[PDB]
Amino acid sequence: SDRVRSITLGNSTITTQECANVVVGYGRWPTYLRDDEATAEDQPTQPDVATCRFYTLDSIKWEKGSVGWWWKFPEALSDMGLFGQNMQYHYLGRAGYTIHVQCNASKFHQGCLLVVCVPEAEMGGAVVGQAFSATAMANGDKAYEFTSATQSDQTKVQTAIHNAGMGVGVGNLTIYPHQWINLRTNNSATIVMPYINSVPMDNMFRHYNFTLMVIPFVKLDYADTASTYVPITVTVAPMCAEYNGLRLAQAQ
Amino acid sequence: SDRVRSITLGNSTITTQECANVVVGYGRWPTYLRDDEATAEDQPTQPDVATCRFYTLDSIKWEKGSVGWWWKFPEALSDMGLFGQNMQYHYLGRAGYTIHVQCNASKFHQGCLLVVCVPEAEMGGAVVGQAFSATAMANGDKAYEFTSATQSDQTKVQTAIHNAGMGVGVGNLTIYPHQWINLRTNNSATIVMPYINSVPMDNMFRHYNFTLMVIPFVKLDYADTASTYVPITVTVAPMCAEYNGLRLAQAQ
Amino acid sequence: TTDQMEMFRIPVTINAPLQQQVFGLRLQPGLDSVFKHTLLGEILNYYAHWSGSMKLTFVFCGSAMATGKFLIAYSPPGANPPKTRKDAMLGTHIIWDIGLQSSCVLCVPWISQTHYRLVQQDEYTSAGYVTCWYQTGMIVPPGTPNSSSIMCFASACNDFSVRMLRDTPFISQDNKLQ
Amino acid sequence: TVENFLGRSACVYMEEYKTTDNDVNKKFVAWPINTKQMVQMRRKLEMFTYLRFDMEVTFVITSRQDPGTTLAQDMPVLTHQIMYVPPGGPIPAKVDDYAWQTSTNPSIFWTEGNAPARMSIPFISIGNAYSNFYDGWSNFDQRGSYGYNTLNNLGHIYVRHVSGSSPHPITSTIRVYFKPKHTRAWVPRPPRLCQYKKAFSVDFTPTPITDTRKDINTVTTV
Amino acid sequence: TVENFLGRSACVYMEEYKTTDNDVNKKFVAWPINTKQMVQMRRKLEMFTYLRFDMEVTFVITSRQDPGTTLAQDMPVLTHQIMYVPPGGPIPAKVDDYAWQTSTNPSIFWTEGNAPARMSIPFISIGNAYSNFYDGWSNFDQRGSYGYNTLNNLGHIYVRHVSGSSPHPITSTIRVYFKPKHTRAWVPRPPRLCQYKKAFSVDFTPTPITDTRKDINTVTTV
Predict the structure, then answer these.
(1) Is there a contact between A208 and D133 if contact means CB atoms under 8 Å apart?
(2) CB atoms A50 and B49 under 8 Å
(3) Which of B96, B189, D194, E137 could form a disulfide with B115 if both were Cys (CB 3.0 to 4.6 A apart)?
(4) Which domain of life does the UniProt lineage start with (chain C)?
């Protein structure tokens, strides 16, 4: 079958026995910066296998009452091996990614997740006019969660799920690269995101190029099974990573 | 002239206006491990430009009464950028090196140094039978010094210069790859060392493949010049570095 | 500064501590005081955008008898400037050796996320730092001065251009002249 | 087509400046060019994340005599000067200052009674496309300004009466229209649902998805 | 390109002339053509030692009714005359004198409410290029005038209202703009650092090379 899938980057391989297809950016495969699109003049580093490989973030639990989660990139990978090290020593960076979201249940469980990558997912504050800090939206590979109720805590982002933290209709997030994990047919989702920005390269700490959101559109449900929660794991591999402007490492 | 020399590795370039030639190992240029000479089966990393570049160690002072110095490799480079990082994360490593020893004086100064690379420079203790620790011979890029007098301190290596710490005649060190810096004609020495060992790869912390020794055979001397000491600087670049057996980083 | 001409002289001396820094400057050719009034900076100040590589030529002005090697580097922007030669050597650099050829050219490449940077530079449009360190040291024979000067020239490369004509902040008046 | 949807002139700003007043600042306008203060144009542009286009700018300037006890006067036709000051150029502090010489900045001198002034500006960004949104900071530290405002540095527009001091004050109102042309747009976004609260931030007050009806089967009007 | 850098109209002069006044000289302008009185244009031209170009001249004329106790009047539209008097020609001593006949000097008659007056003048120097500087004297003796002013003899511009005597005075202000075109420039010089003090001399007050910072390593802002 086509359900079978194998992906190898560097020293890591991912396999899936029940998948859908592989969504590719806006039909654009990741690629290194061309000479006719560059501004920064120094010779870049392209660590290759050391950085372009699969990194598995901490797992999370999908429970009957879960509402949704988000991770901002590249921040989510800032501590991952040499990818994180290269981010720290360089002023500029550029990369695409293979995102593989894993979630297995059973033929007797039901549920359905939207797995989307939102470019420039600029978010609103819990209380309009009140500024929040970076910590309200990203911190290493920590998963952030949406809420059903509207957020009151001004130190937070407006987490009410139906507006996806952006002031738009959550059911319209489908115009962004996405895949669905319907427990009845899938067991994982794979999206290849190319580099998307208004400038050729950018600083990797200061700018979150895109946000991965995993949202349960149909709640997790099951009968008298001994299994309770269903884990969700995110594994991602940078692709065509290149960096410019080497100098001392950024403390954080 | 041929005295002019330019060398570029990675993002670094070295230039010299008054040199001799370039000594190359035993006529052997550094090279990656071939398939028919390998044992370790995992795919190696070859960081390329990130590791194969010039690193400048701390400088030292050549004074009228100096007697000689030594640095053990790869230990001397254990803290140098990604070269050191790769040494820490891998069980096995392999590399050749371009060693560039710098020393400029003036047409009125006189002096002559032997710059040698001794493979397996196993040394004797200050007091026979008494064991010493690693710290008695290497510690990062710290230059160790020989002495005229015979060493009494049992925590040290037998540093008496005329036996080069090995129990041989110091004037016979010329059978090892070497070059002379005679102040009257040179201003630097460049030796390219290939990987030399009885096994294809080896652990980089546990084994010092070779030792660089810089020994004044003719003392530094000068007249009524305001300059007193003459600095000696060592710049070295790993070549064809490859590593196998990735795992957690070694604490030190 | 007591004497205005001293501004053009970069000090270099004998027996300098190993790996010592000679100077450090931030790359804002149209905004930083080091560049704003040079030919290049003055032209930039009649525009709002700029793009391209630059040539920083260094000329050693000590006696023919002095020697020395210096490491001159360029660090693309990042949260922190290099504080040590070890930090600096990881970026774009050249190792300058003094001999018959008195001058050396560090060519700082155009490395940027955007095609153009602003003349009135900001953090988003940050360009980085240029620093210089002793590679070995300035050695001298008997009977020569103990310190010497290095000079720095700057000009644009053939890939350099400016955009958006604007008035310069460098000239003004309160009244008609006469 | 996006060219057609965006290609109509829209009012992006308006302000008044007096011919004569005791307050220096009431006699000229100083506007930091942006497209976030007038709600209609803003919502349209904001339907796309990135935009690249040339810009046609048209100005509509009208004048009215201020009410007062004695209004009899005979003032000749008025002429206005509109000057564009790119970021960093000298800014005028009063109607009669040297900066108005415009030896290099572009200016338009226009006289009332005539066709509205107009001109084209090419794509002037330092980037490859204009950004309607910017999820980031100005400082590498992840501090400083947050949002699209950090990328706005298009300069200012300054306007004054030329030598129009009148015995009794006259108030002119300038309206500036933008019409993008030769347009390209990338990565479309959901239209703004919540009303706008600030000119330089995305800030809003939660607004419900849509309006309600009595039950899920209600299909009549009464 | 130099054509582009110099090719924008810049205000090189401005003066006022009244419609009615007791002082004969307050009713017309007499200007000795030169490019040294308005600082911006001057600095640009002065970046080159010699220049050769054709010249586009545009005039912006505006009128305002002078304030007073009784302002009610109904004055018809005003018409102005701008006459160029080459060196040596008869100069007008009052608004109504014979010289304004312009049988040979070039004049422009312009009526308010219309597009600003404009015309082109070719390269008129007696030399092969205009000189921005002249390190020399007028007399062979090495005496007399010193400097560029000795080479300035381009003539005058005279302007008056045509038959505009009004019951209550009206003040017109004329602004003259120069835009060089078909330009050639030779031997470039450092830009003027010191502020200008005189219209007809290089004279200045010593100004420091540039501004200072605390030490040779200071690279931060705060």
Answers:
(1) no
(2) no
(3) B189
(4) Viruses
Q: Tokens 């004497």 — which residue? A: C3
What method was applied to determine this entry?
cryo-EM
Residue B212 host element (H or E): strand B210-221
Residue A192, CA distances (Å) to A24, A25, A178, B184, E35 in order: 5, 6, 10, 63, 64
Specify which residues C130 forms β-bridges with: C25, C74
H or E element in which residue C118 lies: strand C117-118
Burial degree of D79 (CB within 10 A; 0-12, 13-18, 19+): buried
> Contacts of residue B47 in chain A, CB cutoff 8 Å?
47, 50
Q: Which residues of E touch C21 (CB under 8 A)?
A: 217
Nearest to C76 among A42, A197, A205 (CB): A42
CATH number for the domain spanning C72: value is: 2.60.120.20
Q: Do E39 and C24 touch (CB under 8 A)?
A: no
Residue showing tokens 């560059």 = A38
| Quoted resolution (Å) | 9.5
- Rounded Cα distance, C114 and D153, in Å: 14
CA–CA dist A173, D112 (Å, integer): 50
The residue written with tokens 């349960």 in the block is: A216
Number of domains in chain C: 1
> Which residue in chain A has the smallest CA separation from C128?
A245
Distance from the A60 Cα atom to the nearest Cα atom in chain D, whole angstroms: 26
For residue B243 the two structure tokens come to 């590593």
Pure H helices in C24-163: 39-44, 85-88
What's the CA gap between D118 and B154, in Å, rounded? 91
- Any chains having at least 3 CB pairs less than 8 A from chain E are C, D
Interchain CB contact of E139 with C (< 8 Å): no
Rg (Cα) of chain C, in Å, rounded?
Answer: 18
Helical segments of A71-228, H only:
81-89
* Whole-number Å distance between alpha carbons of D46 and D201: 12
Tokens 């001004």 appear where?
A: A154
